Design a protein around this ligand. Structure first.
Ligand SMILES: Cn1cc([C@H]2C[C@H]3CSC(N)=N[C@@]3(c3ccc(F)cc3F)CO2)cn1
Length: 376
C-alpha cells in the first residue's frame, strides 16, 4: 500500500541526540527541525533565542497564529520545559502533502531540555492525549492530522543509527515495504497513553531469565523513539547483566562498564562481537496464547562513543523503555487504527556475517495477560 519515496530518509540526527524531522509552522512557513518522540504527546518548539538554538518559532511573523491564552508547565525526570499554548498551521515538507491546524506549545523557558550542539529546536510528541500536558483536552499533533485530512491513522519508523550522523525514515500514514525484510509481527497496544506493550519472556542467547513476567513490565513497558537506551526495571536489569556477564566471560570488564560509568575499547576493527550474547524480548501476540520474539545484537546495545563503546542497557524505575537500542534493529509500525505495534527486521540494521537482528514466531505462551502490571 506500500511505497512512499518522498518520506524515505526524512530523519536525521547525531548519535545520542535523537532523530529529527523537518517541519514548518505558521504563515509564511517557518522551517524547524523537530525531534520525533513516541514517548510524549506535546508538539513544543523553542520560541525565544536560547543560545543552543539554531532558530526558533517567531509567533509575531505568523498571520495564522492563534493564542490559546493558557500556559503549560512540564517538569520531567531529567529536565523541564514551559511555554505558552497556541495553534498554527503546520506542515511536514518530506511527509504527506497536507497542512493542518495544530496545537503548539511555544517554549519560553527550559532546563536540560535542549541539547548543546544538536540540530533540533522542538519536539513532536507522537503518543496519545492521555499523557499530553496540561491535560488530555490538548489534542496531540497526529490526532489533529488524522481529524483534518485523509491521512491514515498509522505511522512507521525506521531508525538507522550511524559526532557521527544518524538517519532514518518516518512514514506518515503508511508502511514502506522496502524498509524491512521478512514479515511484520504485531503486538497489541495495551492502553492508549504511551505506546504500552507487554513483554512475556526474556532470553539472553536463548537462555530464559526465568523471572515472573510481571517484573518485565513493572510498572509498564513502552516503545520510545525519544530514549537512546534499552531501559529495564531494576530487578530485570540485575538478572540480564548477570546473564550477559556470564555469556561474555572470556573477557572481563570493570563493574562500572555494566552500569554505564565507563567505556570499553578494542583496537579499531577488532571488536569481539561474537563474545557478546543476543537479547530476545518475547512480546504478546495478536492471538490467545500466541507470542513472537524480537532479537537484538551487541551491535545495537554496545554504542560507539581504537573503537570505544558504552553499554546502552540500563536500569529504570519507570519500567521497560524500548528506546533506540531496540528500534534500530527494526522497522516499527505504530498501527494506531488497529491498536497494535508491528515489528519487522530493519533493512538498515547493523550486523555481521554470523548474526542478524530477528523477528520470529509464532510461539505458544500461556498466561500472557498475567504479565501486565496493575496498580492494586
Ligand atoms: C509524558 N511525558 C514525557 C515527557 C518528556 C520526557 C523526556 C525524556 S524521555 C522522552 N521520551 N521524551 C522527553 C525528551 C526526549 C528527548 C529530549 F532530547 C528531551 C526530552 F525532554 C520529552 O518528553 C513529559 N511528559
Amino acid at each position: 500500500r506500500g511505497s512512499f519515496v518522498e518520506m524515505v530518509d526524512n530523519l536525521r540526527g547525531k548519535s545520542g541526540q535523537g532523530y529529527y524531522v523537518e517541519m514548518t509552522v505558521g504563515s509564511p512557513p517557518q522551517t524547524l527541525n523537530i525531534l520525533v518522540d513516541t514517548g510524549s504527546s506535546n508538539f513544543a518548539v523553542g520560541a525565544a533565542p536560547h543560545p543552543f538554538l539554531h532558530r526558533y518559532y517567531q509567533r509575531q511573523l505568523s498571520s495564522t497564529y492563534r493564542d490559546l491564552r493558557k500556559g503549560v508547565y512540564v517538569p520531567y525526570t531529567q529536565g523541564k520545559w514551559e511555554g505558552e499554548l497556541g495553534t498554527d498551521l503546520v506542515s511536514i515538507p518530506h511527509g504527506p502533502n497536507v497542512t493542518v491546524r495544530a496545537n503548539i506549545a511555544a517554549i519560553t523557558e527550559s532546563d536540560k531540555f535542549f541539547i548543546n550542539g544538536s540540530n533540533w529546536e522542538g519536539i513532536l510528541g507522537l503518543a496519545y492525549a492521555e499523557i499530553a500536558r496540561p491535560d488530555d483536552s490538548l489534542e496531540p499533533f497526529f490526532d489533529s492530522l488524522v481529524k483534518q485530512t485523509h491521512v491514515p491513522n498509522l505511522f512507521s519508523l525506521q531508525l538507522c543509527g550511524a559526532l557521527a550522523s544518524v538517519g532514518g525514515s518516518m512514514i506518515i500514514g503508511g508502511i514502506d515495504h522496502s524498509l524491512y525484510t521478512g514479515s511484520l509481527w504485531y503486538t497489541p497496544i495495551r492502553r492508549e497513553w504511551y505506546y504500552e506493550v507487554i513483554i512475556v519472556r526474556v532470553e539472553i542467547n536463548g537462555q530464559d531469565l526465568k523471572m515472573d513476567c510481571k517484573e518485565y513490565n513493572y510498572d509498564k513497558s513502552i516503545v520510545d523513539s525519544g530514549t537512546t537506551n534499552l531501559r529495564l526495571p531494576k530487578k530485570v536489569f540485575e538478572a540480564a547483566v548477570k546473564s550477559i556477564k556470564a555469556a561474555s566471560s572470556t573477557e572481563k570488564f570493570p563493574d562500572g562498564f555494566w552500569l554505564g560509568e565507563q567505556l570499553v575499547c578494542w583496537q579499531a576493527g577488532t571488536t569481539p562481537w561474537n563474545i557478546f550474547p543476543v537479547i530476545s524480548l518475547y512480546l504478546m501476540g495478536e492471538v490467545t496464547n500466541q507470542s513472537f520474539r524480537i532479537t537484538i545484537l551487541p551491535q545495537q546495545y554496545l554504542r560507539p562513543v581504537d573503537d570505544c563503546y558504552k553499554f546502552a542497557i540500563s536500569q529504570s524505575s519507570t519500567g521497560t523503555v524500548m528506546g533506540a537500542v531496540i528500534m534500530e534493529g527494526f522497522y516499527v509500525v505504530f498501527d494506531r487504527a488497529r491498536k497494535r505495534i508491528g515489528f519487522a527486521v530493519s533493512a538498515c540494521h547493523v550486523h555481521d556475517e554470523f548474526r542478524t537482528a530477528a523477528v520470529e514466531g509464532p510461539f505458544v505462551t500461556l498466561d500472557m495477560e498475567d504479565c501486565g502490571y496493575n496498580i492494586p
